[PDB]
Amino acid sequence: EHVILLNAQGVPTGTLEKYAAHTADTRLHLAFSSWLFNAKGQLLVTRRALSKKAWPGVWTNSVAGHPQLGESNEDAVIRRCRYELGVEITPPESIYPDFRYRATDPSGIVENEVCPVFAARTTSALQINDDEVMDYQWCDLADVLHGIDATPWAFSPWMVMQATNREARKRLSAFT
Amino acid sequence: EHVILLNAQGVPTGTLEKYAAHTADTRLHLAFSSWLFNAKGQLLVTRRALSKKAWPGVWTNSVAGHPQLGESNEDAVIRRCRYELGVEITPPESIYPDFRYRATDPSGIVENEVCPVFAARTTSALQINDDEVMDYQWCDLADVLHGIDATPWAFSPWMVMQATNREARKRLSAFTQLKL
Ligand SMILES: C[C@](O)(CBr)CCOP(=O)(O)OP(=O)(O)O
Ligand SMILES: C[C@](O)(CBr)CCOP(=O)(O)OP(=O)(O)O
Ligand SMILES: [Mg+2]
Numbered sequence: 001e002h003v004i005l006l007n008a009q010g011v012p013t014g015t016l017e018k019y020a021a022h023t024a025d026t027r028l029h030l031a032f033s034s035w036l037f038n039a040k041g042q043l044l045v046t047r048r049a050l051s052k053k054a055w056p057g058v059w060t061n062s063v064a065g066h067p068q069l070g071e072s073n074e075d076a077v078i079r080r081c082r083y084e085l086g087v088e089i090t091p092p093e094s095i096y097p098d099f100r101y102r103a104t105d106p107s108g109i110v111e112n113e114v115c116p117v118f119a120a121r122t123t124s125a126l127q128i129n130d131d132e133v134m135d136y137q138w139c140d141l142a143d144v145l146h147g148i149d150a151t152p153w154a155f156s157p158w159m160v161m162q163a164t165n166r167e168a169r170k171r172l173s174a175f176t
Numbered sequence: 177e178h179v180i181l182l183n184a185q186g187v188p189t190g191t192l193e194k195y196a197a198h199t200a201d202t203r204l205h206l207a208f209s210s211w212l213f214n215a216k217g218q219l220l221v222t223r224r225a226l227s228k229k230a231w232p233g234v235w236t237n238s239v240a241g242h243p244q245l246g247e248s249n250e251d252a253v254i255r256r257c258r259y260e261l262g263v264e265i266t267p268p269e270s271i272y273p274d275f276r277y278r279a280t281d282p283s284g285i286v287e288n289e290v291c292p293v294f295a296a297r298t299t300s301a302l303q304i305n306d307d308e309v310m311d312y313q314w315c316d317l318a319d320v321l322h323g324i325d326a327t328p329w330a331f332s333p334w335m336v337m338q339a340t341n342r343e344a345r346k347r348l349s350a351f352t353q354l355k356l
């Protein structure tokens with residue numbers, strides 16, 4: 001399992017083992033983020049497990065990850081949905097294709113990514129992988145956005161940045 | 177360190193080593209919770225360290241702890257402010273003397289407490305203790321309360337419970353005034 005290093009432009013130039021790649025000096029690599037909603041339109045919010053190298057124990061959107069070499073973004077979502085949440089989904093739809101961001105977590109671990117964002121509906125029940133998720137909540141998107149707007153610090157900076165992009169919010173909202 | 181055990185009614189009966197007292201079977205003991213505001217009236221919110229036995233990595237109010245034998249509640253507040261946050265404060269005011277709290281954390285660890293709540297002003301700069309606090313923010317109380325109502329599940333349950341108590345909340349509000 002690896003991450004894909006990107007040069008100044010989004011061109012892959014090689015790979016790194018996933019664990020070894022997230023450091024205090026993380027280099028730009030390829031990733032995804034997705035927001036999941038159930039049949040009713042509830043958003044799934046998850047809390048990262050305390051064993052995650054980056055942002056452990058942090059509340060964030062439904063699922064995020066690292067596409068492997070030759071893997072489509074959409075396949076990557078599907079894979080991590082199965083792996084982290086044991087859940088089936090509908091074809092992921094683009095919500096924020098040009099999201100790119102760098103941030104530092106409270107222990108100094110950095111994420112540095114070209115991270116296209118997706119949305120999908122779940123088609124099965126969750127089956128939680130507690131190596132990845134320690135808690136989660138099904139909730140109204142409206143409420144989630146309010147909490148992000150009032151106390152953004154309570155959420156992953158990654159979730160906050162995506163939810164505050166005007167178009168991404170529209171599309172998440174239109175997603176219901 | 178230890179905790180002070182309380183019987184079926186809130187009366188002390190002795191002490192228990194602190195680690196050993198916090199389990200899936202935690203017996204009632206004494207605790208405190210305090211909400212701190214800077215001169216500007218902003219509230220300090222903190223994120224519990226990942227190594228805390230109970231609610232690790234969770235966003236919560238300013239400071240909480242366990243009074244020791246011979247120690248007043250208000251002295252315990254002073255001490256943990258100093259220990260956890262490196263910070264000097266004004267005399268703690270009692271804002272919810274009757275708060276009681278029993279709850280299980282994400283891993284099964286139980287807290288079961290008589291936990292009077294306080295408010296105070298910080299009088300010095302912070303010196304965060306990373307063994308106790310992994311993150312923090314200075315915030316407007318209004319914003320914190322709005323976030324708590326919108327996504328209460330993202331915060332420690334004690335913080336939500338205290339902030340939703342009517343009389344306590346009025347006291348937090350009073351501490352948002354700017355003071356010189
Ligand atoms: C964390 C992010 O920077 C927010 Br987009 C994306 C990476 O996902 P990740 O959860 O870190 O990856 P993984 O699921 O494999 O742990
Ligand atoms: C969390 C509480 O149930 C507040 Br209701 C009391 C425990 O605080 P604590 O910070 O965990 O205690 P300590 O600082 O002494 O370790
Ligand atoms: Mg992931």
Ligand SMILES: [Mg+2]
Nearest residue numbers: 239240241256
């Ligand atoms: Mg404490």
Ligand SMILES: [Mn+2]
Nearest residue numbers: 031111112113
């Ligand atoms: Mn990464």
Ligand SMILES: [Mn+2]
Nearest residue numbers: 207287288289
């Ligand atoms: Mn306790």
